[PDB]
Amino acid sequence: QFRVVKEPLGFVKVLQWVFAIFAFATCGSYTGELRLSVECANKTESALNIEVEFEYPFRLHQVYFDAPSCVKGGTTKIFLVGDYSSSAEFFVTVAVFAFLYSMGALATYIFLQNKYRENNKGPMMDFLATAVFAFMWLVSSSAWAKGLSDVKMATDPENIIKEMPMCRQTGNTCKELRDPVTSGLNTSVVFGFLNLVLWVGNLWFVFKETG
Amino acid sequence: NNPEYSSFFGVMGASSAMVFSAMGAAYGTAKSGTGIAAMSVMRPELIMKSIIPVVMAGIIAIYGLVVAVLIANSLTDGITLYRSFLQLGAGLSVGLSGLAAGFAIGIVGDAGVRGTAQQPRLFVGMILILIFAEVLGLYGLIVALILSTK
Amino acid sequence: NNPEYSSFFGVMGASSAMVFSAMGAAYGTAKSGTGIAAMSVMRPELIMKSIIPVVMAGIIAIYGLVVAVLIANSLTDGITLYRSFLQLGAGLSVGLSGLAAGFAIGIVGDAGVRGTAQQPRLFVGMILILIFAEVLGLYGLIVALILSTK
Amino acid sequence: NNPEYSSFFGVMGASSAMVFSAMGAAYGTAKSGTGIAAMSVMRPELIMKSIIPVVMAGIIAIYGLVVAVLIANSLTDGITLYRSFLQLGAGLSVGLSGLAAGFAIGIVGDAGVRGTAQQPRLFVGMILILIFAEVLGLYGLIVALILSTK
Amino acid sequence: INPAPYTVITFPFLFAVMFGDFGHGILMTLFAVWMVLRESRILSQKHENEMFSMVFSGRYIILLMGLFSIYTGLIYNDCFSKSLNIFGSSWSVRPMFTQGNWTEETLLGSSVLQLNPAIPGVFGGPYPFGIDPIWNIATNKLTFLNSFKMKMSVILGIIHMLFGVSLSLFNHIYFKKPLNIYFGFIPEIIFMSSLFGYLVILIFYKWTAYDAHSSRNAPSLLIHFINMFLFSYPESGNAMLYSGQK
Amino acid sequence: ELFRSEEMTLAQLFLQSEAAYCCVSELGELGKVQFRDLNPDVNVFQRKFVNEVRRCEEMDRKLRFVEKEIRKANIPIMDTGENPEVPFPRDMIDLEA
Amino acid sequence: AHSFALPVIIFTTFWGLIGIAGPWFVPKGPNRGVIITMLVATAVCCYLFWLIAILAQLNPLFGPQLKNETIWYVRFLWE
Amino acid sequence: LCCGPKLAACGIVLSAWGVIMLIMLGIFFNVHSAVLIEDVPFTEKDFENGPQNIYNLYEQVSYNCFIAAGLYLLLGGFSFCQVRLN
Amino acid sequence: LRLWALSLAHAQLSEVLWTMVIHIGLHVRSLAGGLGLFFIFAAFATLTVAILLIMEGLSAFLHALRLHWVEFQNKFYTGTGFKFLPFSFEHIRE
């Protein structure tokens, strides 16, 4: 029935589907980089470009790069700090599965209109599952936004520069050639907020439908 | 500085771990089976009950493997000559515990299966008394693992 | 400065603590096991009352094992050769005492089991002699614990 | 640096590995063979199917033979003075394991052919009881394959 | 007092700790569930195999066995000789181990193992459940694990037999035996407690009162217990848990 | 709360002989009333129902004869229902015959 | 690395609320006493097991012994 | 009829348990990247240049078990077909 | 301490079973490794359900039975009673 499709009740399900996939397609697909230069007292030991790349799952505690050791021209390994997959992976998987549920609900509105109207059962379970998923999204998105802020404070070059004894040596001064960029993650969290608002509004409209 | 062929106490331990156990389980099966040949003369329906003590007799051989394989894997050449002694002690301990369990299991499973071939009620006591033989073998394996890991 | 080859004492000591006790254990389930088989053949109603000596054999296994593990966990490579020797002596004493307890418990358990069926008045005396066997095991255990911390 | 007279540890290992198992197989063929000789009188139809424990004692001896040939394959004069000791332990272990397995198999198979003759139903149960002893001999093989290759 | 209702839960727990594995527990719960789903068909079917009948009659026993077996497989952190990783092994920081005076340790490590030291000032932290999987791969796991397993077993045994000794009092109360209370339950339970409860609180006291700052010349549980039992109180050689304990 | 054995009290039934047959019939149908013998020093013959038991047992042996004949005949022998109502007249002797 | 008070409070409330709220919910059936004893016994036993396990894991005395290949792998892997 | 369930129910249950085991182990080989804490064994002699080759090896290792998974799946299917011969 | 004993026994048995059977099925070889691993894990499964589930499980049940019978029932389960046999025609099936 085209009337059921024309009703905003299922059109908002379509909107949720689209903007949920748009959200979690970019939440866990952003990448960036930042480069470092070492001003060694010995020019033979000095560096100018030291590429460091970050991407989802954003396990900084498992990422490393090699920089000069400032001693006899050697090098050393530098492991970044931060386990931010504990929120990012959880939120991404959460968004994926609840978006699959959104596809299921849209399918319920499309073909199973008869069972949807049968004893009003479809609205009951859809509303309950949607409320559960909305609360789950609130928790996961808030935790992941706090993790994004933690990543932001973690991307400051001066922290890693001051933490390294070789950079604290006189005459060996490491300055960040290129700073990282994280705009796509801001777009991602904006999409997440939009998804949450959409689903809250649809919860209101579904509760109106039930009564 | 380690004296010559230093591992040999522990290698003889790996031997003794299953040597005496092979003697023991062999003893246990040795009298049990000759018993069974007589039990099934007059009550062939208990050919299933005949298998009860023997599956449990297999555990002595299992224990003989337990430390033997462990030390066949964990052996090396540069040994301080004291862990070698510990392994010798563990092996001979579990082995003679295998002898003890074998002796008890053979004779007691024998007698109990006679008394089950006559009185079916005896079965419960047969199993109950059988318990303590594997408790003994367990005690042997306890000390053997402690010495193999201390 | 500590003489080498000291641990031949303690490593064998734990083992010997449990060896002769294990032999006594295999003896304690043996003869009383057969007697209980016969007396549940003739009458099954006292089958539950006849298990006490088997528990006593288990207790002698405890007497052996506690000292065995106490010697095992009290070990090292650089020993002063005094305590290690004491552990050896303690192990021999406790093992031999446990073996004596095993012999006594097996023989007396069988005798009292075959006795109580005819004359019920022998059951209490059987129990008393079982206590005496346990007291023998405890005597051995006492000297073992004294030697474990001297 | 390898001390003199080192290879015998391996050579005597390979020597014992099959020889002690051959003593076992001699007992295995002796006992059950005599029993089948007795039991042909009343049931000539069971003569061929009573061969089972004898074949199995055969494999018991194959265990020691395999270890003995393996050690010969790995035999060398330039031994590190540790591998030959592992071969010694492996051979001693498997040989006497075959010894015990063959003895037990002979007597149990003898009693089993007695039992199968007096009552045909025992033919399968006794076979399983014999499989147990074969598994024990196989464990004796197992440890010796671990050590003689280590 | 019927002991069966209490056994219904005690016995699964003791069989679980005696069978402490996750995967095996799953397999034999699957077996028990197959018994229970096939209840009606098996009931209307002759089964001369008496072993099958005896295991089937107590099939719900097997279900309880397996449920507790699964729970203990989880707490012990074992499943076919493998620990479960929730990635909460936050105790030993490895780059910080390099920072802790371990410079080019791998050069020696090509032939040795270099056990991690205690209290480097930079380690610390528990595991979310059971044992840390780092011990599942460690060589000192034998010394580390088996010891508190021993002490654990002691604890559980004490609590169980305490419960039994209380059941004896309940019998005495029912059958009106004041002699079995004044000279019976009360004196014997205080006899037992005055040793074993003290042992328990001493165990926990050491577990929560001594750390690796005092590892060198630390106390010992068995030595102190022997000192108690033999009335021997040496001045030195054993760090004293608290003043006045003698 | 402490669970112990259900209370047991024993109960003396005094009733007519014919009514005792009918009540024992009802209790055989029910099956919750253990009967204790009160005259253990009396053998089967003095209990005066020995002939009834002997006749029933001879009947049952003949029933097993007919059973094995039926097994030789391979009859499905359903034995589904109508069994537990167990009527109790005296004409059962005629049916036995 | 993990506050101990957190799992402490979590499982105290969990097992305690189960064990204490059991009896005040069971209907008065033929086996009310039986099932309340069942749940309380299960709760206390499992609870005590976890407590002793975690407290044993608390306050270590020595680290784990690891291979040098394991040192390489954990170096490159994480913490 | 042919190959009745009396001899094939074991096949059904073992195939089911095998496939569940195999997909579990495979996901622990691939997604977990075969964490050496949970799976110590490997076959590498030279890895001083970095862990990249072992990361590549994880793929082949996780491939090694899905083959057995497919074998168990087809075995279970044919065993079920045999059972349905009633 | 039989608790401790059997717990260690199971743990070490499982560890050995892992170190000998499923360990050797892992190899650098791509296809032959998996083909061998097939039958290796078949034997693994058979032995696993044999030694630990059946025998050690029975021993565990048995040790717990002894523990409840001796270590627990001796203190409070004193004396005995007469097994009540409420009369009932239980031969409906018989």
Tab-separated table of C-alpha atoms in Angstrom, chain G residues 15-58:
chain	number	residue	atom	x	y	z
G	15	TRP	CA	24.903	-11.716	44.365
G	16	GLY	CA	23.505	-10.120	47.520
G	17	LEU	CA	20.364	-8.803	45.853
G	18	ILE	CA	19.751	-12.176	44.215
G	19	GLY	CA	20.191	-14.070	47.478
G	20	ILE	CA	18.166	-11.648	49.586
G	21	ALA	CA	15.334	-10.979	47.111
G	22	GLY	CA	14.854	-14.691	46.438
G	23	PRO	CA	12.620	-15.563	49.400
G	24	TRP	CA	10.431	-12.441	49.141
G	25	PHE	CA	9.291	-13.371	45.606
G	26	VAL	CA	8.769	-17.165	45.502
G	27	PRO	CA	5.091	-18.245	45.588
G	28	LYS	CA	3.846	-20.444	48.433
G	29	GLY	CA	4.095	-23.726	46.561
G	30	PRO	CA	4.964	-27.294	47.551
G	31	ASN	CA	8.696	-26.477	47.315
G	32	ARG	CA	9.090	-22.850	48.404
G	33	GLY	CA	11.584	-23.636	51.157
G	34	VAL	CA	13.491	-25.960	48.831
G	35	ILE	CA	13.916	-23.404	46.067
G	36	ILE	CA	14.844	-20.526	48.384
G	37	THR	CA	17.515	-22.714	49.988
G	38	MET	CA	18.637	-23.617	46.471
G	39	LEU	CA	19.090	-20.053	45.273
G	40	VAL	CA	20.780	-18.859	48.470
G	41	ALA	CA	23.231	-21.783	48.425
G	42	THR	CA	24.090	-21.203	44.762
G	43	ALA	CA	24.523	-17.479	45.343
G	44	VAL	CA	26.813	-17.761	48.359
G	45	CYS	CA	28.972	-20.488	46.811
G	46	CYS	CA	29.544	-18.734	43.473
G	47	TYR	CA	30.053	-15.414	45.272
G	48	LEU	CA	32.699	-16.805	47.633
G	49	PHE	CA	34.523	-18.479	44.751
G	50	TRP	CA	34.830	-15.234	42.802
G	51	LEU	CA	35.905	-13.302	45.909
G	52	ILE	CA	38.719	-15.714	46.754
G	53	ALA	CA	39.828	-15.793	43.115
G	54	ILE	CA	40.058	-12.016	42.736
G	55	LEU	CA	41.670	-11.544	46.149
G	56	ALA	CA	44.302	-14.139	45.267
G	57	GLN	CA	44.905	-12.215	42.045
G	58	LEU	CA	45.312	-9.038	44.130
